Design a protein around this ligand. Sequence first.
Ligand code: Z41
Ligand code: ANP
Ligand code: ANP
Ligand code: PLM
Ligand code: MG
Ligand code: MG
Lengths: 409, 10, 225, 226, 392
Amino acid sequence: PLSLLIGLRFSRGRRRGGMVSLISVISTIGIALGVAVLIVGLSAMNGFERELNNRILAVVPHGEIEAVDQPWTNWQEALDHVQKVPGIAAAAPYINFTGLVESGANLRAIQVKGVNPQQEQRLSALPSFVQGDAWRNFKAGEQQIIIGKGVADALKVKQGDWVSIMIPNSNPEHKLMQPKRVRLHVAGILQLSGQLDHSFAMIPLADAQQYLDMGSSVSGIALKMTDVFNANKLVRDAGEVTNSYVYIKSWIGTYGYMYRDIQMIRAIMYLAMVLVIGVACFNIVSTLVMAVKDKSGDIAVLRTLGAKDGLIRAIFVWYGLLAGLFGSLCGVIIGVVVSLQLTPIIEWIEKLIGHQFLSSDIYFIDFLPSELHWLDVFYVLVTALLLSLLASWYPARRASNIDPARVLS
Amino acid sequence: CSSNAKIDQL
Amino acid sequence: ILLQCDNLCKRYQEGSVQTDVLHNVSFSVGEGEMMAIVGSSGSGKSTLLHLLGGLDTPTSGDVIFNGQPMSKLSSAAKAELRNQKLGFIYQFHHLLPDFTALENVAMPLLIGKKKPAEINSRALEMLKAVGLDHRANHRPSELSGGERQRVAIARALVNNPRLVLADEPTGNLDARNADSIFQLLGELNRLQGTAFLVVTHDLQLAKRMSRQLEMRDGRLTAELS
Amino acid sequence: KILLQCDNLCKRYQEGSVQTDVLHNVSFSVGEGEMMAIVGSSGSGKSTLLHLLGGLDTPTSGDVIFNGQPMSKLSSAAKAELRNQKLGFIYQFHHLLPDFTALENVAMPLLIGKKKPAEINSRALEMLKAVGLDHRANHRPSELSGGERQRVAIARALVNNPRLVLADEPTGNLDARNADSIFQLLGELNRLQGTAFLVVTHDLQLAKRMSRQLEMRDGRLTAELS
Amino acid sequence: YQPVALFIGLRYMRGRAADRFGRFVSWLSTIGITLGVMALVTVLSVMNGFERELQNNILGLMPQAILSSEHGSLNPQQLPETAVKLDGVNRVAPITTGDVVLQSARSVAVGVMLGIDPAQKDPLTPYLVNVKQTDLEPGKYNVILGEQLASQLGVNRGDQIRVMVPSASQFTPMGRIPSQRLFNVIGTFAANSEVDGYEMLVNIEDASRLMGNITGWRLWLDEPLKVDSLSQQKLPEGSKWQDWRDRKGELFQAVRMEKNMMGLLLSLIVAVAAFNIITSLGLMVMEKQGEVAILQTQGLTPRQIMMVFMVQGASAGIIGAILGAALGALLASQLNNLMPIIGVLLDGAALPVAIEPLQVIVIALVAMAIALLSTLYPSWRAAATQPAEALR
Ligand SMILES: *C[C@@H](COC(=O)CCCCCCCCCCCCCCC)OC(=O)CCCCCCCCCCCCCCC
Ligand SMILES: Nc1ncnc2c1ncn2[C@@H]1O[C@H](COP(=O)(O)OP(=O)(O)NP(=O)(O)O)[C@@H](O)[C@H]1O
Ligand SMILES: Nc1ncnc2c1ncn2[C@@H]1O[C@H](COP(=O)(O)OP(=O)(O)NP(=O)(O)O)[C@@H](O)[C@H]1O
Ligand SMILES: *C(=O)CCCCCCCCCCCCCCC
Ligand SMILES: [Mg+2]
Ligand SMILES: [Mg+2]
């Protein structure tokens, strides 16, 4: 299965000169720079989407339906109506607040919500990231409250210490009263990725009824549909079975910007890597014009032996592909090791300079994940070879218009 | 990133 | 009659000046006939050896070889004419150094798209007739200058050519080894009916040929030498 | 006095601790007005000798005296002034720059010695009228033939009164038909201003009108035998 | 002709083949550096546009730097506005700063205290929605809440809230009382920022923390992005430098870190194009071996022959950085006039482009230097070689 074009012209590349031994080295690192960073760059973007569905998407409520200054009391009839809709899986109520912690002279804003302990597992992956042994001790009526790990970095407390939070006051008339101040205790701290730790706190549903003087009144209903790609249209028709109009929202207006910026870098980093190999393909052009005048005493020989026009063109086409085969395939072998072992590599540079990047204050995570996909390996292999076809076509066209009788032959 | 818009919709 | 070449005026613009190194050559080439064209050291030799092959354009008339002119044939048809009907022997070691001594002889057979059972068998027959079968799997860089010229001679007579164009067969090898290949060149005229011309600037290296007509600045029909 | 006397110019090459001896125990002497003709073999000692006469190589075994100025204790920039003014080099391998025309190829040693442009347009064409190559000035040395660009390199280094011209093989490519249009005008420079040169060749017909005949046999110059 | 013999030996070597492709090979190193700077200015100008619109909505609305005391409060009779003569300060205004907590009848919120002066000019004055500036009398305890702060609290105009200061709590042998007062609201303001949920306007004269004086002086800098260099200045006595890095020290620090990652990724085009100069100049010596040794015989020192190939690797970097910085400014300034070449407009909210004139000088001077690092090795091989042992 060996052709005259590829394997029979392989011995032409075994040349010998002066400083030509450094030319094959400098034409390999320059073209592998556009492949090695693109392999570890596309695998790092796949790791962001993997941690989005596990630590961001699986912990937030998808749909939220609230009244317009009413304590919603008829939530028993509005539970079976939204459950039998073909496209919404489960539902669970929530009573959100805007309390804050006053313990140790530290100011920190927190969002206190009240859900059911025996119902929160059926619609979200929230208690699957608790730093304790389990979460089965989270019961109602025992004055318990579970706060995040990032809160305790500012409260300077740990598991088993008493906490003092603030509760918004309830009043049937618009009048100001003295705010309440109770003393509770934490039962297990937890972190989610690096972002929702200092902005989350949950209480039992039965404890929220006695703290706010409400019998069986809730404020909102949280659900979860099948696909998260169309969460704006499936939330509009879900609230039309209770009353005329309610407050409708989703995660697109709050956390939907993380999926928007994950596609913008894929249109910039892939566009920048074409310009890297596009300049790196000029080294193949510079070594192909010099290969014409080097083998100028051999093209005119084959024309006397009886070579056609297409035989002379296709020698230098696959000659430049051999220089591109040694550089593009060497970026794949160096790209797998950095992608599969990115976790000790990034941690080694963070303990060198001291000031580590990607802190858990503004970003949604704190570490750099990695997920290597074999579909992007075939995409970068056909891209570096297509740019080598363009670079080795125009010097190959000039190698056939030369005259065999002009040279000393 | 750094492009934060943060506009809601009722 | 094989080749009756007429109107061979080559007006090449060598520095915006049309040269007159060849002017109206009415030379006749026969089947199995040995014509030794004796020319000067710089007048018209290598220009004439490149026009009968098909490398350069005839630009005055045509070279009607076997009833087909070069000016009327395409570049692809003239490539098939230089493969199975012609042979090229030079004096500048026109062999590929990236290949071995076996692939240099088998190179016209690999270009013409023949069957692989006939490439290796016919390449060993030409080296055995010359006497280079013991160094068949060698490279043309460590051999002597007199031994590498015999590989390029056996490179031509592979697929039974009709006219072996020879540009100074001696010069790279000695006259003792050039006498051993002359009985091989005479025996192949009785085997396949081949023909060849020996062009030499000297007077003592073309006495064994049949016609001894000379050449004086394009006047190749001058029999007076 | 004597212009140049080479004493013990032994040039021995070394690779793999192997003594490659091509020049040993020479006593060559060059004088003002005296012409030499070094006729030897094609591979014995010719070009290895002429590279040491101008300081292009290190002998590493002795020293060559030249006008009271050796090159044993000199720097890389101190030998550049001697190789431009009083020294000249003529080769046969067509060592002409193809990207430069004949206007500045002859004036290329003139631009090195900080010569002003008032004398560039009046010195590089003084050697082109007698040779007949003045009208072929606005051209290019790339597309010319073999018998056209050979006469440019002969009168290339004769721009700043060279005291020693190391000519080498004046006929290697061109025919002897046009070679007799230069082989009598190049030796007249010794009798009206004073200079010296030498002709080195391996053939046996370019040393018949000289004044001193001597051969070279891999570094042996004792007598004059056949 | 040229009076210098160092530049005349290369002007006829930058392509001489009369062809449409023979001249394109020698100019391959020019386009590789030109496209490197062109793909660097137009991308970093959008990152500078996001940083310019972030400091005008967040840093341009809050007090950036304040010169407060180091052992308590400040005395304006001892340290007046004539005493503060720091560089970069454009205006001095008295203000106080304190982490407080709000209190209402429906919900409880958090925010800071900004004791602005109603007799001076405030940057939040055109952002007011039917609120008067002179309505903050010293003694009526009026407070102006934000739009996002009053939205989650349900406090309309004419109501009354409670502001408690947890930091300035007076010590008592019984209990723990905070120094809190009673404030009434007058209206909200829409500022189009994120500071409408934790900032409020109040009079400077208040007895909610101590006693009566102020804490520090509010200043406005010409550049609030490099306030680290202005912290080691000779300060007057009885003062302590306080910048905006205590609250927003991680917001704007991540924007500067992203410019060092995108700019480093796009700098690989210049590093690859620097490797093309080793291919373009290292192959020229291997073919022009005859033109090197003849120049050594004509009277050129090896020091002068090293500088012949220096400009051959630097003139492509000079014309590559000038044309690269020129086309980087033409593409960035003419991006949002016609149909955008990025495909679909993902934002659609008047995408700004900020072209800093100082940043173009740092980019062009770096790209002219990496072209000189890849020249010292090919120029040394043509100079340190032997004139009589390389070819003849
Ligand atoms: C979301 C971004 C934040 O950056 C921004 O400010 C967005 C504005 C710029 C977005 C592209 C602008 C496109 C329009 C310009 C005109 C067209 C140009 C087209 C391209 C030529 O997040 C980021 O991208 C910053 C984080 C860094 C991610 C990319 C770098 C990956 C990590 C660094 C690797 C460096 C490796 C170098 C050594 C091997
Ligand atoms: N393209 C060309 N290449 C070489 N010579 C040419 C060319 N065009 C014209 N000539 C002329 O041909 C001369 C060279 O001699 P040529 O006619 O080729 O026969 P030749 O030299 O005797 N062959 P040979 O003696 O065996 O090397 C030159 O001096 C030119 O006058
Ligand atoms: N680097 C070298 N290159 C060539 N020859 C060398 C070299 N080093 C040593 N030699 C010796 O030099 C011989 C070649 O002859 P050389 O001394 O160069 O003068 P030359 O050949 O007569 N010059 P010329 O006859 O005009 O080509 C070789 O056979 C070697 O013994
Ligand atoms: C900003 O608002 C959205 C932040 C989401 C991305 C956070 C990480 C940014 C840097 C990503 C670098 C990935 C590639 C690293 C290996 C080359
Ligand atoms: Mg010939
Ligand atoms: Mg010599």
